[PDB]
């Protein structure tokens, strides 16, 4: 359960766990993977097979409102469940500053992963910082990170009848802009 460099006649530094009922022909120690990798090493004097897993697995993301506004952040751990974060990122071997982003009260579970550092808000707003799966975050009011759910638009209803029509009685003239790029810079390169 720790990041360890192992030496079963070969050097590699990973996390070692207990393997399941793996098939071994009583002749091999590691075997071979599809990407020419050696996985699930065998203890050389016993028959017990172990597990080789990278102890830095998956990607993490950091949500910030800008350094000139604040210095607090939120961490999104993709494709893991909440209350499995400290096992996934090996929180016992990290600094105490890193340990406060592995648990607590501001824990929210989305379809993009567990998000820690923002308390959930039941209101709906427009998207400020997109996170994924319909979840956006912002910096709202003393301020904090809100991590709400996005709103598609205003709700309306049309009164339909089989003898009814709406006809405008006035109008207005509107002028709007549209910006389109045309050309870019002309660069030249001398090889020598």
């Amino acid at each position: 359960n720790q990041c360890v460099n192992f030496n079963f006649n070969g050097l590699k530094g990973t996390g070692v766990l207990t393997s399941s009922s793996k098939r071994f022909q009583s002749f091999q120690q590691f075997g071979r993977d599809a990407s020419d990798f050696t996985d699930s090493v065998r203890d050389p004097q016993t028959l017990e097979i172990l597990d080789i897993t990278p102890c830095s697995f998956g990607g993490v993301s950091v949500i910030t409102p800008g350094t000139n506004a604040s210095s607090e952040v939120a961490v999104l751990y993709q494709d893991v469940n909440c209350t499995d974060v400290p096992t996934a990122i090996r929180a016992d071997q990290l600094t105490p500053a890193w340990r406060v982003y592995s648990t607590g009260v501001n824990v929210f579970q989305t379809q993009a992963g567990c998000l820690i550092g923002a308390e959930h808000v039941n209101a709906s707003y427009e998207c400020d910082i997109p996170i994924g799966a319909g979840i956006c975050a912002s910096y709202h009011t003393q301020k904090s990170i809100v991590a709400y759910t996005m709103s598609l638009g205003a709700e309306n209803s049309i009164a339909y009848a089989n003898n009814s029509i709406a006809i405008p009685t006035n109008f207005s003239i509107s002028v709007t802009t549209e910006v389109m790029p045309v050309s870019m810079a002309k660069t030249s390169v001398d090889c020598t």
Partner: protein, 149 residues
């Protein structure tokens, strides 16, 4: 950037008896180069430190592996070839060489993995020894002629 290993785990087999080095390096006599002999080595614990205060090697060259890494390695098919030549012919015991030794007496393969060890043994071997001077063709790697007249 947040995680780093801190301690080391090493697991090795149960072999415990030392490997016979004086039986090979300090044998009573050595064969001729045209009649070289091969010996298998198995169930050993190979530590080269025990020869430090008794031997002196003029040549120690390894191929496919680096020296000072043999301490922490496990081998499977260990074999030893012993013969006796002149002092100036040690340079011909190498993959891809030429000369009277490299093609008519003893030839190494191109994908050779192992080490070559040599040392001078004057005042120990006094008898007459033989070698192949010419042949109709060249020897294949790890092959022996073993014939006369």
């Amino acid at each position: 950037f947040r995680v780093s290993p801190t301690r080391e785990v090493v697991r090795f087999p149960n072999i415990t008896n030392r490997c016979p080095f004086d039986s090979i390096f300090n044998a009573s006599r050595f064969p001729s180069v045209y009649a070289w002999e091969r010996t298998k080595i198995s169930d050993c614990v190979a530590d080269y430190t025990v020869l430090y205060n008794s031997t002196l090697f003029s040549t120690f060259k390894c191929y496919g592996v680096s020296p000072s890494k043999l301490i922490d390695l496990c081998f499977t098919s260990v074999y030893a070839d012993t013969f006796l030549i002149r002092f100036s012919e040690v340079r011909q015991v190498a993959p891809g060489e030429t000369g009277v030794i490299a093609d008519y007496n003893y030839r190494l393969p191109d994908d050779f993995t192992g080490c070559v060890i040599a040392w001078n043994t004057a005042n120990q071997d006094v008898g007459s020894y033989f070698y192949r001077s010419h042949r109709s063709t060249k020897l294949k790697p790890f092959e022996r002629d073993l014939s006369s007249d």
